[PDB]
């Protein structure tokens, strides 16, 4: 089968800049290549067919070139909703094969997170488990530290983080940190705090509550 | 216009078989072939096979002996069936249609069907409020202890979408998934507007609507 | 670099 090599694997640019995706084939495929866009939780979207031919409803800032083994997909003025992975497909040789994709990230100005903390609901406490959630909202860049403290004891190993993909509108990330503990442990303590470190804060922000207000 | 609607996601036991139905509208199966493509962590995008207008099938080489594609023109249905699934067959499966009847440039895609191959048992989630406590209030829902992926979450039956973040599910040590969905709203609307997260875990047909209020 | 079923996006 034809091996399609896409490079680089990550691509980070700023809005309005031109960007180019690379797709190289293991042997000549003429111009028998198609390009696809995949947004978060989306299905692939056909952008270019046969190296350079336009597709209905696709913005004109998408174009493609190349022939033989070296092919390029180009966006001349990157927009925020262009955040996605981009895939090439060959069909000169059966079976049709796809590249491994290139991720396109967007740069933007530093944005400090807004921090919120939620105690476990009384509903969940009926089940014998307590979840404490700390939300970091609409920040950039992605790197962030979340430190948990219970009665000034550092928590380690009993929290999990999840991070959204970049937002299509404002290019920010959001993060959730969930501290999980047994109800017995949760009842044996009072002060619950998440401390948040981020480039956009001059000093760490701590959101805390005391169990039972 | 042209649409492809696939059947819902689900669990399949190892060494067992997979069945997906693709229903099409905006065109006839007698005029177009329908392709099947999957997307997995192990191998990325993979072309699996196609059923053509006249009923002939082609299957990609590593699938000839465990893949079967059938259709019902009158009912606009294409049936995908694959035998003896293992763990690396966990993937999102799409049906797809090309621009022209004979070609392979896939301009129309189904929404995908996430198939999880595992010996474990299906379990619906519990939904718990994340209650609100610069005039912007955050609130959400904790969708906890379900298997397998995915779960869909919306707010106020689709009417609230601005400021919504639904985080990727994380696998807990229990082998069960968990996620939270959050939204920021004006705090002055908390006494006037109702906020409900609509949770649906189709693998277990568990549908929960959780009202989230200030505690 | 690997595709993630949770987000339908490439992660690492």
Residue numbers in the entry:
A (entry chain A): 1 to 213
B (entry chain B): 1 to 133, 139 to 220
C (entry chain E): 1 to 12
Quote the study on this structure:
Multiple strategies have been developed to modify monoclonal antibodies, including chemical conjugation and protein engineering. Recently, we identified a cyclic, 12-amino-acid peptide that binds in a cavity formed by all four IgG domains of the cetuximab Fab. Owing to the location of the binding site within the Fab, we have termed the peptide a meditope (medi-, middle, + -tope, place). Based on our observations, the peptide–Fab interaction does not affect antigen binding. Herein, multiple crystal structures of meditope peptide derivatives incorporating natural and unnatural amino acids bound to the cetuximab Fab domain are presented.
Finally, we also produced and characterized a 4-bromophenylalanine variant of the phenylalanine at position 3. Of note, there are two meditope–Fab complexes in the asymmetric unit and thus we observe each interaction twice. The guanidinium in the 4-bromophenylalanine variant makes similar hydrogen bonds as in the original meditope (the bond distances NH1/NH2⋯O=C are 3.1/2.9 Å and 2.6–2.8/2.8–2.9 Å, respectively). In the other complex, the Arg8 side chain is not extended, placing the guanidinium group distant from the carbonyl (bond distances NH1/NH2⋯O=C of 3.3/4.0 Å). Of note, the coordinated water that was observed in the tyrosine variants is not observed in either complex of the 4-bromophenylalanine variant. This loss could be related to an unfavorable geometry owing to a slightly longer bond [C—Br versus C—O(H)]. While the contribution of each of these potential explanations is unclear, the bromine is positioned such that it does not interfere with the side chain of Arg8.
